[PDB]
Design an enzyme around this catalytic site. Structure first.
Site, short mmCIF file in Angstrom:
data_model
loop_
_atom_site.label_atom_id
_atom_site.label_comp_id
_atom_site.label_asym_id
_atom_site.label_seq_id
_atom_site.Cartn_x
_atom_site.Cartn_y
_atom_site.Cartn_z
N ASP A 138 0.85 -1.16 0.00
CA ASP A 138 0.00 0.00 0.00
C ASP A 138 0.90 1.23 0.00
O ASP A 138 1.73 1.41 0.92
CB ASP A 138 -0.87 -0.03 1.27
CG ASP A 138 -2.15 0.77 1.11
OD1 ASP A 138 -2.15 1.79 0.40
OD2 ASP A 138 -3.18 0.35 1.68
N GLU B 258 -7.31 7.84 -10.90
CA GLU B 258 -8.59 8.27 -10.35
C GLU B 258 -9.33 9.20 -11.27
O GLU B 258 -8.78 10.22 -11.68
CB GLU B 258 -8.41 8.91 -8.98
CG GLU B 258 -9.74 9.35 -8.30
CD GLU B 258 -9.47 9.76 -6.86
OE1 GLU B 258 -8.99 8.88 -6.12
OE2 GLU B 258 -9.73 10.93 -6.46
N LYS C 7 -10.07 4.34 -12.50
CA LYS C 7 -10.60 4.12 -11.18
C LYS C 7 -11.79 5.01 -10.88
O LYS C 7 -11.68 6.21 -10.85
CB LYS C 7 -9.51 4.25 -10.11
CG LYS C 7 -10.01 3.86 -8.70
CD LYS C 7 -8.85 3.99 -7.65
CE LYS C 7 -8.46 5.48 -7.47
NZ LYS C 7 -9.55 6.15 -6.66
N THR D 37 -14.03 1.19 -7.26
CA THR D 37 -13.65 1.37 -5.85
C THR D 37 -14.83 1.98 -5.08
O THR D 37 -15.92 2.11 -5.64
CB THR D 37 -12.32 2.18 -5.71
OG1 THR D 37 -11.71 1.86 -4.45
CG2 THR D 37 -12.55 3.72 -5.82
N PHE E 184 -12.88 -1.73 0.35
CA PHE E 184 -12.18 -1.19 1.50
C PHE E 184 -12.71 -1.84 2.78
O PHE E 184 -13.65 -1.35 3.41
CB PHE E 184 -12.36 0.35 1.60
CG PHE E 184 -11.61 1.15 0.54
CD1 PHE E 184 -10.63 0.57 -0.28
CD2 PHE E 184 -11.87 2.51 0.40
CE1 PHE E 184 -9.96 1.34 -1.25
CE2 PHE E 184 -11.19 3.28 -0.57
CZ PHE E 184 -10.23 2.68 -1.40
NA NA Z 1 -9.03 12.30 -4.54
#
Ligand code: NA
Ligand code: CL
Ligand code: CL
Ligand code: CL
Ligand code: NA
Ligand code: NA
Ligand code: NA
Ligand code: NA
Ligand code: NA
Length: 333
Positions: free
Chosen positions: A18, A100, A136, A160, A182
């Site tokens: 991570d 993202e 993402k 996600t 998550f």
């Molecule tokens: Na962000």
């Protein structure tokens, strides 16, 4: 052998450190990593990497029609800088960079699809093919719909803010490449709702949910990869041993490597051919199931807000860099 818990785990699961910044990506060399607003904010603090931010401003200045406004510049820069940093990640890692998509578009399928296309074409312009990229996207109804469209044109997506079976199944039925639930956020919600101080091992509600999703996906023969992420403790990770990927804090990596004993592959399903129901959630069912799931609907909403906050903070930083860049030119000979 002797085989550490880490070595056992790596035989069952793609383990990925991570990371939230470029230094950690260089240090840990994760197979996969992410360009997002937070990584870029982190980099702004670094005298090396900040130059790449200023470069994205320059590049955006060169790109836009004559007469562009500062607002148009900042918007274009948000796009370009995300890609610049993704290309920088791809020089380090061997696998895929998650990129993202602006979370402010999370409820707009058309805008999400158009942004993904734009980011993919920017990557292409810079010599990077789409197979190295995961787009993402938050797992709202509209985000999953956008991903469904994108996957059909070979744009691979990472879905996600994914919290329940409804979202997982909707992604699988839409042929999504990868989901990233998550786990620790699911645990947090239950502790916060109830005042239960712990949910140990197999009782962890995040582990329960991802266990179910994995078992269903493999038994049904779905291709969608499951990456467990965002862990609160090491037991959660151990419970999900055998998942496709697990994104794990460097300290947990070190601890797993230190440990001996036996790690059971709990996530061990393979294809089954039988009479079990094939679940579907069309729009109405999806919405109703989400409405009934206070955990998923709140953690999805809060996550989108958190992503939106970080991109707003990025926009503010880019405004600062622009100012600094102008000042430097004016006071230099
Ligand atoms: Na962000
Ligand atoms: Cl939704
Ligand atoms: Cl606590
Ligand atoms: Cl200068
Ligand atoms: Na332009
Ligand atoms: Na963007
Ligand atoms: Na936007
Ligand atoms: Na156990
Ligand atoms: Na696996």
């Amino acid at each position: 052998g002797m085989k550490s818990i880490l070595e056992q785990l790596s035989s069952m699961t793609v383990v990925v450190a991570d990371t939230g910044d470029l230094d950690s990506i260089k240090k840990f060399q994760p197979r996969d990593a992410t360009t997002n607003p937070s990584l870029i904010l982190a980099a702004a603090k670094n005298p090396d990497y900040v130059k790449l931010i200023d470069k994205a401003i320059e590049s955006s200045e060169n790109t836009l029609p004559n007469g562009f406004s500062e607002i148009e510049l900042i918007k274009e820069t948000v796009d370009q800088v995300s890609v610049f940093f993704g290309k920088e990640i791809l020089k380090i890692i061997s696998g895929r960079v998650s990129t993202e998509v602006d979370a402010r578009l999370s409820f707009d399928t058309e805008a999400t699809v158009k942004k993904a296309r734009k980011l993919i074409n920017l990557y292409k312009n810079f010599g990077i093919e789409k197979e190295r990229i995961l787009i993402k996207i938050a797992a709202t109804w509209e985000g999953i719909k956008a991903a469904e469209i994108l996957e059909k044109e070979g744009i691979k997506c990472n879905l996600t803010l994914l919290f329940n079976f409804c979202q997982a199944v909707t992604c699988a039925n839409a042929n999504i490449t990868l989901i990233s639930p998550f786990v620790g956020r699911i645990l947090d919600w239950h502790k916060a709702k109830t005042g239960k101080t712990s949910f140990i091992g197999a009782e962890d509600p995040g582990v329960i949910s991802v266990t179910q999703i994995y078992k269903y996906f493999k038994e049904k023969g779905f291709k969608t990869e499951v990456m467990g992420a965002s862990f609160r403790n090491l037991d959660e990770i151990k419970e999900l041993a055998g998942c496709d990927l697990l994104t794990i804090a460097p300290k947990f990596l070190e601890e797993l490597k230190r440990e001996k004993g036996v790690l059971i592959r709990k996530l061990d399903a393979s294809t089954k051919i039988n009479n079990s129901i094939d679940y579907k959630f069309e729009e109405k069912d999806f919405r109703l199931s989400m409405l009934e799931d206070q955990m998923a609907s709140e953690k999805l909403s809060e996550g989108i807000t958190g992503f939106s906050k970080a991109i707003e903070e990025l926009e503010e930083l880019l405004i600062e860099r622009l100012s600094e860049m102008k000042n430097h030119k004016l006071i230099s000979a």
